Design a protein around this nucleic acid. Structure first.
Lengths: 87, 293, 297
RNA sequence: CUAAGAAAUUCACGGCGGGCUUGAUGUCCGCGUCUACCUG
């Protein structure tokens, strides 16, 4: 999420998460994970870059869908994207 | 000698209120008739806007009127200031035209930036621009928005043919009226986002719409001339150029890169800044407003 | 006479049935010699234990209602009366009257003591204010608190703390709770300037004061005549030769009053809050006794 | 260490009967409110 003038700072990453991140929202596959690369998990605003931490062929071959397309306007303990988090 | 007390500037590049519609893709040649989108309730309730289930492509339509006569103040208080201001704007115009500013306007016309939160999520966005001299069309254009970069400043043949038309309008040669339409394949039943009103949506003839000044804001994201950091790239031209979505305030008056200080030493002590700042001060005089003490 | 170190402030001192006459000549606010002596009694009852030293007071007078009426006659006022008990015969009493007042003030004191480091800056104001809710201060009692919101917490400011901007910030942070009163300060300067202007007709000082409050002319504020101490006329006595004294350790001097004039400022237009701490200059060299406010302007 | 120390004013009451406020009137006449704006 680059410096954009239209969307919010916490708005663009929240938009491109499950819906705009449709490959990370409805991609199909339980052999990957969306890990926060620089998400500060102590201030409640921890969206910097959700890296798709997957295997070799899972994140390299099974992640070439068009969900990453249309992102040129902005692109460039164990807790993950599951039903355990407070936002 | 000294400055002016109260100045106003009537705006130019006047947009309209964009109405919205729906329909199916590859039926967009017949886009003078489409069932318009109505606002609905959260059945505390609030109001949303959603496409019909059979339809998938949003169509946003508005008209853009270009007036021209930039440097003429609509209200002044001293002829010794006014002749200096019109002299300086005339010397700006005869050196180079509005053509760079025109292609920067036509880029924001080219990519569908006025679809604010409806641009993302789409995958085939095509605008169509008709310049009209009478009630019939006079010059057509049909772009593709996503092939053009949202930060990339290209130089096409059709976009330059549009830019010379807009520059001729800004100089005050003819009459410009662009009936801009924009088709966005968004999918079936996706949440179209119109403008927001005090908490409700914005319909005019029982059909949802964007505010006019929002499209007028989106049409003037041209400022790549930061002092700070060009990683943001373009921004909406403002005096004390500010972003409410990001809370910053670029071109601080402690720097000598704001608008008012630029105009001050540009018309009084006749200190010409760079061409990349003459572009900024003229582009701010285009949007008009209330200047002076 | 020297500088204060800590502006101990009492928050709200509701007073019931205090004195109002306070001189042979005034009848308004009670004599601030009472406020001078009240903190010396407070130091004598507390300040030896907590190891402090108190010298000056300010007054704010949050409200003041006297007890007067007019019996369908003049605009002059008669006073309140108290029924007196019967004598040995049980017939009547030679009743002698005096005024009353329901005044409500909140004084701010001045501390010089070293005992601000060993004792914390809120215990020394939680003990002093708790002591002074059990003593009299002009002839009237000091009332306790009702059951509502509570401004009964006091403060304790140090004027030595912080820089000049911090001093002028905490000064407003103290004055924000002290605003709706009217601070009263001495005005000894302009009398001995007005004298020589009024020296052509008659130089009697009581005449100069009496026509500084009586088209119409201009008064440059709210001038006010107050007692200002005591002039002495009798010489010193011995500690143990006079009959009917309150003790037998101090000498005695018969005294008459000394009338001066003051001013009822607002708390804002003062320079700082070390300008209205009522000390008492007390030269005994065949002299007199006064109580004033130096650095008044 | 205070013009400090001290203090029960109380009981009872018939305001009450009557009235003409009338008459008339010219408020006139002139006027530029502009310029802008992202509500997620």
């Amino acid at each position: 999420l680059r410096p954009d003038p239209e969307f919010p700072p916490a708005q663009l990453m929240s938009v491109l998460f499950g819906k705009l991140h449709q490959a990370l929202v409805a991609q199909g596959g339980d052999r990957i994970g969306v890990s926060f690369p620089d998400l500060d998990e102590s201030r409640s605003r921890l969206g910097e870059r959700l890296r798709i931490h997957a295997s070799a062929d899972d994140l390299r071959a099974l992640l070439a869908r068009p969900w990453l397309e249309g992102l040129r306007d902005h692109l460039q303990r164990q807790v993950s994207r599951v039903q355990a988090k407070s936002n | 000698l000294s400055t002016a007390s109260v100045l106003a500037f009537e705006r130019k590049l006047d947009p309209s209120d964009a109405l919205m519609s729906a329909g199916a893709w590859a039926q967009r040649d017949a886009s003078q008739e489409w069932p318009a989108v109505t606002v609905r309730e959260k059945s505390q309730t609030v109001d949303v806007a959603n496409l019909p289930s059979d339809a998938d492509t949003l169509k946003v339509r508005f008209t853009l009127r270009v007036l021209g006569g930039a440097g003429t103040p609509s209200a002044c208080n001293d002829a010794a200031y006014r002749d200096k201001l019109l002299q300086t704007v005339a010397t700006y115009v005869n050196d180079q035209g509005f053509a760079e500013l025109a292609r920067r306007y036509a880029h924001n016309l080219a990519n569908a930036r006025f679809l604010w939160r409806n641009r993302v999520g789409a995958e085939a966005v095509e605008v169509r621009i008709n310049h009209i001299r009478q009630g019939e069309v006079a010059r057509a254009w049909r772009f593709d928005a996503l092939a053009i970069g949202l930060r990339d400043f290209k130089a096409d043949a059709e976009l330059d043919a549009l830019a010379e038309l807009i520059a001729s309008g800004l100089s005050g040669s003819g009459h410009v009226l662009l009936e801009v339409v924009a088709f966005a394949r968004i999918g079936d039943g996706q949440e179209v986002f119109p403008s927001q009103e005090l908490k409700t949506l914005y319909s005019v003839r029982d059909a949802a719409a964007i505010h006019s000044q929002k499209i007028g804001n989106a049409l003037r994201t041209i400022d790549t001339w930061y002092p700070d950091e060009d990683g943001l790239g373009p921004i909406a031209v403002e005096p004390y150029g500010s972003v409410t979505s990001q809370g910053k305030a670029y071109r601080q008056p402690k720097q000598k890169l704001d608008f008012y200080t630029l105009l001050d030493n540009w018309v009084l002590r006749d200190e010409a800044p760079a061409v990349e700042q003459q572009h900024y001060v003229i582009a701010n005089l285009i949007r008009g407003g209330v200047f002076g003490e | 006479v020297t500088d204060p170190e800590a502006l101990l402030l009492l928050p709200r001192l509701s007073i019931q049935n205090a004195n109002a006459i306070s001189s042979p000549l005034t009848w308004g606010f009670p004599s601030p010699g009472a406020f001078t002596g009240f903190v010396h009694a407070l130091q004598r009852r507390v300040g030896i234990s907590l190891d402090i030293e108190l010298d000056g007071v300010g007054i704010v007078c949050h409200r003041f209602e006297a007890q007067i009426s007019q019996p369908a006659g003049k605009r002059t006022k008669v006073f309140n009366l108290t029924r007196n008990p019967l004598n040995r015969d049980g017939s009547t009493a030679a009743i002698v009257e005096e005024g009353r007042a329901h005044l409500e003030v909140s004084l701010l004191l001045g501390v010089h003591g070293d005992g601000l480091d060993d004792h914390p800056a809120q215990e020394i104001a939680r003990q002093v204010q708790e002591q002074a809710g059990a003593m009299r201060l002009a002839g009237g009692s000091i009332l306790p608190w009702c059951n509502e919101r509570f401004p009964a917490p006091n403060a304790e400011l140090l004027m030595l703390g912080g820089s000049d901007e911090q001093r002028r910030k905490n000064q407003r942070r103290l004055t924000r709770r002290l605003l709706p009163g009217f601070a009263l300060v001495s005005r000894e300067a302009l009398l001995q300037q007005h004298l020589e202007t009024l020296r052509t007709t008659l130089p009697e000082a009581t005449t100069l004061d009496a026509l500084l409050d009586l088209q119409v002319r201009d008064k440059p504020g709210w001038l006010v005549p107050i007692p200002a101490g005591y002039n002495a006329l009798s010489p010193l006595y011995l500690p143990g030769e006079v009959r009917n004294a309150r003790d037998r350790e101090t000498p005695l001097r018969f005294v008459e009053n000394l009338f001066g004039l003051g001013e009822w400022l607002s708390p804002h237009r003062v320079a700082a809050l070390s300008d209205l701490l009522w000390y008492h200059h007390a030269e005994p060299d065949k002299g007199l006794y006064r109580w004033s406010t130096p650095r008044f302007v």
